[PDB]
Amino acid sequence: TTHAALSWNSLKIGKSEIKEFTIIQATISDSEKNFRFTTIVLALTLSVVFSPHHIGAASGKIIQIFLYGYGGYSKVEISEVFKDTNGKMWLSFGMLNSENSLNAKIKLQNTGDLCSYVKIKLTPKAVYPTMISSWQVNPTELLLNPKEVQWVTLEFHPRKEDLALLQKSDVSHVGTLLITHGDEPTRLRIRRLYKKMKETGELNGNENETFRNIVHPICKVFSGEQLVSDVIPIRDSVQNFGDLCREIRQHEIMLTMEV
Amino acid sequence: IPIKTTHAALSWNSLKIGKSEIKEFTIRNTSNNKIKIQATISDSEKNFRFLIGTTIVLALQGSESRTLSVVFSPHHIGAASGKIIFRHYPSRQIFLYGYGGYSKVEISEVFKDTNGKMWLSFGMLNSENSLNAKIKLQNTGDLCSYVKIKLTPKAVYPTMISSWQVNPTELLLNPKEVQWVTLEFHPRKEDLALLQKSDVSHVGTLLITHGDEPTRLRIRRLYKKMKETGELNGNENETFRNIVHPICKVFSGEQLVSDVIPIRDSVQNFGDLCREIRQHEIMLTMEV
Amino acid sequence: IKTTHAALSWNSLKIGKSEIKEFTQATISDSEKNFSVVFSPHHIGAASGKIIFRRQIFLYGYGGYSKVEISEVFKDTNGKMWLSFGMLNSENSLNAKIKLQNTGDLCSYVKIKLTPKAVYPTMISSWQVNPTELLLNPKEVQWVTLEFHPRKEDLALLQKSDVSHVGTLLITHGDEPTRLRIRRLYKKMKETGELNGNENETFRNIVHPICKVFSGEQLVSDVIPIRDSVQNFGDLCREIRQHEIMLTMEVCA
Amino acid sequence: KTTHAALSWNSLKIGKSEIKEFTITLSVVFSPHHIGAASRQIFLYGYGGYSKVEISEVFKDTNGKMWLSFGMLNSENSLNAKIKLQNTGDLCSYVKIKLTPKAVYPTMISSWQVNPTELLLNPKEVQWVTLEFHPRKEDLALLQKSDVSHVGTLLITHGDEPTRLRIRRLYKKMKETGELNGNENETFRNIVHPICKVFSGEQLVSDVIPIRDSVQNFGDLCREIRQHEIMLTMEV
């Protein structure tokens, strides 16, 4: 057995993903009957399917080898922004009135069944020491329960120094808003696993230049995090950690401004 | 006066007050003798000048020839007609035409990207319903403005346009006039069959040709004169006709202004006159 | 008894792949066991059938595909194709080429149309493209050459930016048999003049230059026993693949 | 009180002049007569010349984006490509480059091999930057859906080498006194820190030492930091 255990990502009800493991009687000792092939025999690459019947955790046993899954999903839909046929997302503040500053809002809708996590990070195009002081965006980070609606409001007080670069064109790219979102439990799983790997020192050299910067703002305890104990019996490992980071959803709304 | 100009006349486009356009023409002596001629611009409204004042003089030595440049600055909105006279220092005459004012049709309630495109979204297809949107057209100029709108669907079935309803298809806008263009789309099952794959689907493209109305009258007279002679019929005009043909039609509401009849345009100035036809292509999408 | 569809035709389907079409005690009569009704080509070629109510409704189909790949042109992650002429050398004109290869099993048809970004009456076209129209036998590869002679009217608008859009190359391609089918029915479309009012400007412009007799067109007689009609034409004209290539040119310095 | 005990310009092109206002209001003009530094009650600093860092052998868009394609993933092989970098300027150039892949997995940087990661170019020096991608199994799991896949983004921060020495001089003080020692700088440092390290081949020029720049004008000096992004494309 190459993989000591198999862990699936959070999957919506009525969808099944397969995963393989390389290796006598065989049987899935599952009480909730989430994992199937149900009981086989083979003489000497095996593949197991996962179909979440109930929203919630799923733990299975093969005659031993451990199987891990968790059912439900999260779909953060961004609204009141413009989306292109190509795919890119666009938010316009309007024209620059003298002696005034600009401000806008975004709507976030959770169309899933599980809790969702959202970390927002704003990056302006111009650079100067107080480049963070000109933008004020709130909430910077939050959680959304299923079918919850939240408005994120962002105010921009343009200084002369950024507009000195925004001068040239009539519609000026001023910044990019990155929204990292997804399901809350996968964040708990990756947080637990990252604490495990950092405590043992697996990733603390060079390969950690970019990776920490991608996983840092999500492994912290969020504000409003009501600790759910459904994810404590699921132990994920190093080999499947990439498949866990694959469910980190990221979108980059564009910020524009006319003349 | 042995002389042979290149341009029989010089005609300018439409220029804002306080803006000047230059145009040059090559004047050539034909006789192998020594001629010396005076060029005087008889301008009544101070619209045309030289490149100095209102009168110059030059000598030409046996086909030794030159290139003169004339500037145009329309002080008043309205037509401008002058004539340069070449006398000896018997007459030679070249006449000049220009017309002042401008038009700036501004499209509004549409989205503009940093790239340059303009984007209009209908929304999300609700079951048993159809979609609709609107755009604002504002004339911020000094002259009357002309707008021809033409819609091209993305799907290709024989009755593709009958699912689209666009109003107004063609119109004029006076300065500081506001007009709203309404677009209704009741999709047939054949339209959505391709839009399936993505979440935001391109459904059509709306072309808006706009500009100043009088230049349309000038281009219309020139296009009608040229089309009957067969000058503009063949291969090199496939794209040009398709942009300039639907605009030479008689518009609805066209109040015939007689200010452009004293302006004589020619074959030689047809390209730079048609280059000032402003054209934009709004995108039409939805989010299924 | 009465059927909203007196006949049922499909499009040209890939080998071994099935296409379903719905229509609204039960026996069928097909010769090559090809066939709500489902279609699967068991012989690479045309397909026919006459079902028997228990009283006849005619079914038609055609099997095969034509995958014409455009190469030596840059493709985008978003999906837009991009061709560059390079840089405007003084006293010279710019040139480029694209390759088109039919990686399918049926004949492919390719009509090319160019639209410049500059509009002006010169009567000597700065663009020279060859071949404007052609057809490809299976696995036939052809090169399309494009030459641009920049006159001052072209460069007068291309001045502002460093990378200038100079033209748009539309390639309408697909399988020859569906072109014969659409042309055959399109001739009858004109016998009644059914949609000449406003459709005449967006539909005819897309489907008329395809109904002309191509050069090299060797008349295949496999599409004559086919009886597709007006109602399925909307579906039949769906297999006209149309791609757009950008034409770009970098300005000096 | 004249709001600035010192006033610095940027590196200006040959023979073109830029005016700057300095309140007291007053306006002053600079024009470079010699490629090199420049120094009543007067206290002013400036320096003339330019470095045009041109990226070539990469496809550009009418919109302005840049695109590099590795070709198609042949089985059992790994992919590699190269870009040309030419200094069509008059002063030395600095070209700190960093690549960030589009796939998130713990060994991101190791699968990518890019050289040179750091270098500087004197005027009209031409260098080729090679970048090789060994597709690890985590990478292709995301690139499956479409036919043309975005695999990474390569940031090239380039500009004038001499202005970099001034930026380092000001940033070292600004951090030794802790003016900008906080964490909000996490978006600024990522933009300006990888250029303040000592490059290889850096021959210390002493022409930038008499240029006494201060805290307030740092923004204007760091305004001339050119930033381009190259898209990384893989077919199939």
Numbering used by the authors:
A (entry chain B): 969 to 991, 1001 to 1014, 1023 to 1029, 1036 to 1054, 1072 to 1267
B (entry chain A): 965 to 1015, 1021 to 1058, 1069 to 1267
C (entry chain G): 967 to 990, 1002 to 1012, 1038 to 1056, 1071 to 1269
D (entry chain F): 968 to 991, 1036 to 1050, 1071 to 1267
Wording from the paper:
Spd-2/CEP192 proteins, defined by a conserved “Spd-2 domain” (SP2D) comprising two closely spaced AspM-Spd-2-Hydin (ASH) domains, play a critical role in centrosome assembly. In flies and worms, the phosphorylation of Spd-2/SPD-2 at centrioles recruits Polo/Polo-like kinase 1 (PLK1), which then phosphorylates the large coiled-coil protein Cnn/SPD-5 to stimulate the assembly of a Cnn scaffold, and the internal molecular interactions that allow Cnn and SPD-5 to assemble into scaffolds are beginning to be elucidated.
Despite extensive efforts, we were unable to crystallize DmSP2D, but we were able to crystallize the SP2D from the honeybee Apis dorsata and solved its structure to a resolution of 3.5 Å. Both structures adopt a very similar overall fold (252 Cα pairs with an RMSD of 2.27 Å). In both humans and honeybees, the extended cradle structure is assembled around a large insertion in the second ASH domain of the SP2D that loops out of the main β-sandwich to form a “bridge” that interacts with the first ASH domain and helps to hold the two ASH domains in their stereotypical conformation. This insertion consists of a short helix (α1) that emerges from β-f of the β-sandwich and extends as a less well-structured region that wraps around α1, enclosing a cluster of hydrophobic residues that form a stabilizing core (highlighted in red labels). In HsSP2D, Gln1995 in the α1 helix forms salt bridge interactions with Ser1876 via a nitrate ion trapped in a cavity, whereas in the AdSP2D, Arg1197 in the α1 helix forms salt bridge interactions with the side chain of Asp1244 and with the backbone-carbonyl oxygen of Trp976. Thus, although the stereospecific orientation of the two ASH domains in the SP2D is highly conserved, the internal molecular interactions that ensure their orientation appear to have partly diverged between humans and honeybees. Intriguingly, a similar crystal-packing interaction interface involving F1090 and W1098 was observed in the Apis Spd-2 SP2D crystal structure (cyan).
